[PDB]
């Protein structure tokens, strides 16, 4: 038995199904592969085409799963489709309404014409299996839980006809026992409140992130305006006729204005972070308080993309609600990819399940073998220095300790947000002004922003009070205090309420992480790190050897520890050797508007991504030249000679669009397959 | 007691409050001017800066309606904005937080600066008064009807709190009896609709035109699913929480599909806008029926942008529920805009009122005094030949029972989307053969789409039946039967059905254009004539002489009549010595896409309107040369010898652009102050 569960929209690599489809429209897209009951190979579209949270279809994730299998396309027993067919259809139908030179093609037929043309694969009608949406994501949450019997929440934007499901779990069974409507969502209110802080699609964590440092008092009973708690697990949420969002019209009302780009974040907007956190917080726990009792189970597994706030987690664990908890490293759309791929096992035979809670997320490509690594970088040699220590592990603690930040790139990428030691960012925990710095100059975000950290099972008592239940934390998914006595020690990763959104690795979740961990640990005394992602600003997690030796070089990383090798940027990099390339996304513009007189305006340049949600930057007229005689083999210094020469400042110039991820800049050739 | 009327969004000319504002926030912008009761100004932004339906801000409207008036802009006593300004504040509160990037300006701040930047107008808080958007519909509706007191019925998409409601009127005062919400917007329903024909935003008017070509009978119990009448002049629409379309869902379902662009009209397209035309009349006849006995009145006016719905009209007209039925002219937002102002006036002070119904629609700018249309014509002289006969009216009755089309432009534009005898094509209405003739060849539109006829006041009733309730017919509101033995003769205006859009011209409504039918009738015995709107599928209705030259030239009619000028075009017109200017919202750009591996791709150049729903042109490379030079001053002859002269494959291409109204053509200068 070989399934593949799949997640996303439809659209092809260069263009979307319709133009400029939306960000919201089935997004995550990911694609999952499980064989004999046991996830073998998930990784998220995103980290191929380098698109966040992508809506594309995720051919790339297809194919890299069969490889990793070992499968080809025709070994594939079954194939599960994360929504109902009816569903996914009418959402397109409305699409090609709007649309009205959009082909009226559905979900079935867009999905055998990506598996045909992009894999060479005929999938068989009788081997697609549409799902329902919260049943897809209870699967997954469950049957990875190793747990025989549990109470399962699903919380999310929405599912067809529900924004939450409430199941019993027995066996490999699933017995539904509540839902709640989709407007009562809580993934659609946290998300509408997200926009009023200056954020948007996706940036809901970062809310989460900024809510500690605010006062929930101020914006608690503007906030109870828009629910009511009920009775027997009950709720509402009050909307209103004025626009699509339920927080902004009663907030406006009160004097509230919601964020510009670029502002500060006041202390109102952290108390309405504060007051919004604790409002989700409140509803969350009303659901569980009830259902614990009424349905009797001790153990929670709980999924669904809600499940990713990890203080709502937290909270969840000192609740004592219940004996255990689990959530998943992958609670969101892609989960529920997987799960697709369960239920569509399920509804053609017997489902097999795994045998093991699951401890690793590290189940997307590798980076390559011991050879073909080390011959890339070689190609790369102009601009980095390499040395291959006796063991990279050992010098990566001491150059911990002595205050460097590390990439740390090892095996197979994580499936879901987190970073978990296989592409991860890793510093001392201990001084404070690391949170400043690697907010400020190596990650460039917020201020604000907490960082997570990274303790060996071992220690995890010693630091973090993981009281009440037995969560999982070999995924990050819970937010625990840090101890009282040790939150001045671990001055980078103790949030200013003195929690911590902890990784607790072990010899069996990742043992080289924690070989590292706990080597570094026996050289302070401390056997904790940082742990934050590896990506800058512009991307998702960096997925391949390429990916992760540009970020290095465009993220203000000290050392860069990839497979064993030792990585440091030379001390002049000759950018003329990297050969650009186009994203299928990359667009060139040259453009005049209306100009003064109702003539026609200057002329200016311009390189753009053509997605929703898609940046775009002013480029000098030389650039704009140089870029258009983009061929795909040439190099950056030869392509530079028809404007005179990669000058300095056409070196600094397109040294800027690299680090924004607007094309491919590379040496000549790839790593090659896997 | 001079108030501006005020209605539309806060856009300037070249830019939107939001990138890529969506066509449907606050459209039909317009200003309208009311001096001691009576509307003395009126018109449509969309007139102006030449884009239907335009949202952006109406400054040239206050301009021209100031002017007409003789009134600075601080002549003013108050204005009136036509919805309430927590509403429209709610609404610009949530675009902002769609758009991080936008400041944070409010409609009052917005209103203030586009008059101070745009007139010097410095405009008093104290003066701006704010609306119950139904409320101003309601006084626009039943102000200029001429009756003492009505029942009063407001339909559109939705104000502030509501689709619909019904008041009754006496003396001055509107005393609302009931509303309906917005959820049950029958303007919501229609577009909903509208977009399964391909069709958009704008265009519920062609469906209703193709509604007599279908059996309402085919989809009647499938649009039966989607509402529900109910006592008490009650109904409901039975919403669905898949996609925000009422309608979709369900047709989706039940294997209607959508048409594409370019398709044909099908039978099912047919039958279903004839069901969907029966649903709205069933619902509104429901409504009225219950309305007219509860109130017991006998007078209606009907208004709102669902009066627009001519077959409604129509109905309404012969339901015998009334005995007087009057619907003004502007019906739709511009409306709106006008009632703001008398509300405006209620609120500060003393409301006064129209002194008799209204007649005549011609309240926009003129086209000029006699001896500037005169000298702007010779301008137009490379292209065009002109004839000063001694009796314009006399010599267009002969030339139109010669059988040719003729474009008839007088004194002040039509208020509302109907022409009536100031921006007119007119044509014989007996030969069948006139409607794909004119349908194709000069509207160069669909063929389906009926003509109507305009007919003298004392002929009316030999050619239309009139009986059920007395409607006022000066505005074209109401659809009426054509008499069964008169519907050969009237072959290019009686629909399929054997129904007409008449207007009824008196030398009361419109002097001049009644006795040119009346004269045609002399000279023919049919005192009927087809009226249709003097644009082409580009633009809105012309404005200026400009415009209409312009139009003239671009379209394929045989002779222009402008204030008793007689127009032709050259054999070979000279484009050269047209002077091209950017409208403020033409783009010119050159792209790059992605190429085959990774480089470059296509190069392409384009022009382009930078709104939501903007047509776009691909370009030659030598024409996207001399786009690029345009000045607003030098001519396109002499711009074109920087790339070798005007070729006539050149001049070909702009003459396509120049129809499409990608940038504005006209002769140096202007007609100056009109
Ligand atoms: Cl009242
Ligand atoms: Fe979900
Ligand atoms: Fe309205």
Same mark, same amino acid.
């Given at each position: 038995m070989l399934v593949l569960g799949l997640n996303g929209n439809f659209s092809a690599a260069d263009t979307d199904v319709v133009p400029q489809l939306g960000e919201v429209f089935f997004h995550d897209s990911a694609a999952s592969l499980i064989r004999d009951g046991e996830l073998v190979a998930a990784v998220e579209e995103e980290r191929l085409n380098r698109i966040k949270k992508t809506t594309k279809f995720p051919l790339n994730a297809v194919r890299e799963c069969l490889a990793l299998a070992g499968a080809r396309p025709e070994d594939v027993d079954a194939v599960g489709y994360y929504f109902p067919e009816n569903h996914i259809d009418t959402v397109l139908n409305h699409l090609y309404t709007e649309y009205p030179r959009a082909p009226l093609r559905y979900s079935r037929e867009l999905i055998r014409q990506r598996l045909k043309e992009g894999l060479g694969w005929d999938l068989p009608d009788e081997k697609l299996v549409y799902v329902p949406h919260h049943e897809a994501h209870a699967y997954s949450s469950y049957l990875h839980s190793g747990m025989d019997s549990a109470l399962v929440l699903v919380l999310d934007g929405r599912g067809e006809l529900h924004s939450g499901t409430v199941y019993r779990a027995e066996g490999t069974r699933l017995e539904k026992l509540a839902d709640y409507p989709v407007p009562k969502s809580l993934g659609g209110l946290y998300l509408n409140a997200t926009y009023l802080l200056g954020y948007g699609f996706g940036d809901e964590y970062k809310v989460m992130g900024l809510a500690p440092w605010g006062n929930p008092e101020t914006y608690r009973d503007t906030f109870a305006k828009l629910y009511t708690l009920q009775d027997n697990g009950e709720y509402e949420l009050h909307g209103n006729i004025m626009?699509?969002?339920?927080?902004?019209?009663?907030?406006?009302?009160?004097?509230?204005?919601?964020?510009?780009?670029?502002?500060?974040?006041?202390?109102?907007?952290?108390?309405?972070?504060?007051?919004?956190?604790?409002?989700?917080?409140?509803?969350?726990?009303?659901?569980?308080?009830?259902?614990?009792?009424?349905?009797?189970?001790?153990?929670?597994?709980?999924?669904?993309?809600?499940?990713?706030?990890?203080?709502?987690?937290?909270?969840?664990?000192?609740?004592?609600?219940?004996?255990?908890?689990?959530?998943?490293?992958?609670?969101?759309?892609?989960?529920?990819?997987?799960?697709?791929?369960?239920?569509?096992?399920?509804?053609?035979?017997?489902?097999?399940?795994? =045998?093991?809670?699951?401890?690793?997320?590290? /189940? #997307?490509? %590798?980076? +390559?073998?011991? $050879?073909?690594?080390?011959?890339? &970088?070689?190609?790369?040699?102009?601009?980095?220095?390499?040395?291959?220590?006796?063991?990279?592990?050992?010098?990566?603690? =001491?150059?911990?300790?002595?205050?460097?930040? /590390? #990439?740390? %790139?090892? +095996?197979?990428? $994580?499936?879901?947000?987190?970073? &978990?030691?296989?592409?991860?960012?890793?510093?001392?925990?201990?001084?404070?002004?690391?949170?400043?710095?690697?907010?400020?100059?190596?990650?460039?975000?917020?201020?604000?922003?907490?960082? %997570?950290?990274?303790?060996?099972?071992?220690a995890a008592r010693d630091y973090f009070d993981l009281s009440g239940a037995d969560g999982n934390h070999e995924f990050m998914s819970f937010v625990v205090p840090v101890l009282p006595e040790r939150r001045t020690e671990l001055g980078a990763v103790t949030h200013v309420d003195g929690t911590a959104r902890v990784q607790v690795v072990s010899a069996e979740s990742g043992e080289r992480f924690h070989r590292l961990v706990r080597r570094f640990g026996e050289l302070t005394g401390t056997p904790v790190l940082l742990n934050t992602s590896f990506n800058n600003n512009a991307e998702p997690i960096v997925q391949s050897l390429d990916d992760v030796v540009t970020s290095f070089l465009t993220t203000d990383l000290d050392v860069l520890v990839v497979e064993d090798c030792l990585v440091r940027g030379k001390a002049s990099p000759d950018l003329g050797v990297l050969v650009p390339r186009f994203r299928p996304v990359t667009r060139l513009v040259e453009r005049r508007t209306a100009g003064p007189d109702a003539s026609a305006g200057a002329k200016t340049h311009e390189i753009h991504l053509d997605y929703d949600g898609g940046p775009s930057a002013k480029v000098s007229p030389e650039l704009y030249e140089l870029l258009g005689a983009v061929d795909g083999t040439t190099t950056l210094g030869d392509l530079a000679k028809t404007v005179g020469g990669l000058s300095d400042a056409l070196a600094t110039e397109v040294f800027a669009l690299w680090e924004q991820r607007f094309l491919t800049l590379a040496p000549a050739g790839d790593i090659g397959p896997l």
């Open positions: 626009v699509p969002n339920l927080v902004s019209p009663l907030f406006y009302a009160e004097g509230f204005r919601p964020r510009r780009k670029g502002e500060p974040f006041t202390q109102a907007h952290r108390d309405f972070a504060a007051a919004l956190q604790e409002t989700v917080e409140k509803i969350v726990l009303h659901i569980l308080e009830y259902w614990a009792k009424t349905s009797g189970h001790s153990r929670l597994c709980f999924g669904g993309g809600v499940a990713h706030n990890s203080s709502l987690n937290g909270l969840i664990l000192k609740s004592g609600l219940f004996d255990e908890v689990f959530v998943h490293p992958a609670s969101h759309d892609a989960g529920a990819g997987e799960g697709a791929a369960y239920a569509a096992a399920a509804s053609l035979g017997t489902l097999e399940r795994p =045998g093991k809670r699951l401890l690793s997320a590290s /189940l #997307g490509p %590798a980076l +390559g073998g011991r $050879e073909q690594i080390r011959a890339r &970088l070689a190609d790369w040699a102009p601009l980095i220095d390499v040395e291959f220590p006796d063991d990279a592990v050992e010098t990566a603690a =001491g150059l911990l300790a002595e205050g460097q930040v /590390l #990439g740390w %790139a090892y +095996g197979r990428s $994580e499936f879901g947000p987190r970073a &978990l030691g296989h592409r991860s960012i890793v510093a001392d925990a201990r001084p404070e002004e690391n949170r400043t710095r690697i907010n400020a100059m190596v990650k460039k975000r917020e201020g604000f922003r907490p960082f %997570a950290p990274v303790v060996t099972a071992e």
